[PDB]
Amino acid sequence: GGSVIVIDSKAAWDAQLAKGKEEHKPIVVDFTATWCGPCKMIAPLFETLSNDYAGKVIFLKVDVDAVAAVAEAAGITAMPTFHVYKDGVKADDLVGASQDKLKALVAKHAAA
């Protein structure tokens, strides 16, 4: 929902990472699963933040069931896991469903 872009393939993943690098905009990614309780608790905030920061931060969703190869390359072991990507590469991460920590992560990387 919101301004979150759902990733459906490795090809789409690569293309979004490439666009964030060209646009010089940070990317925040939610690695998630619909069987995971904490994922369901935090997804509304991820969506709201995607609206609030639309234009400053790009928001992607990777369902680990839908794109296991992208989940594997990201080294995920618990969910939700949030990654920040800048200039094509992982810059930061945050594991778990803390609302304050997710807000702080987006603000940190949106201030540039």
Numbering used by the authors: 1 to 112
Publication passage describing the model:
Thioredoxins (TRXs) are small oxidoreductases that contribute, in most living organisms, to the control of cellular redox homeostasis. Indeed, they reduce disulfide bonds on numerous proteins involved in several processes, including antioxidant defense mechanisms, photosynthetic carbon metabolism, and protein folding. In addition, TRXs have been suggested to control two additional Cys-based post-translational modifications, namely S-glutathionylation and S-nitrosylation, by catalyzing the reduction of glutathione-mixed disulfides (–SSGs) and S-nitrosothiols (–SNOs), respectively. The redox activity of TRXs relies on the presence of two Cys residues in the conserved Trp-Cys-(Gly/Pro)-Pro-Cys (WC(G/P)PC) active site motif.
In the present study, we deepen the structural features of CrTRXh1, providing the 3D structures of both the reduced form and variants in which catalytic cysteines were mutated. Structural alignments and circular dichroism (CD) analysis of reduced and oxidized CrTRXh1 reveal an identical folding independent on the redox state.
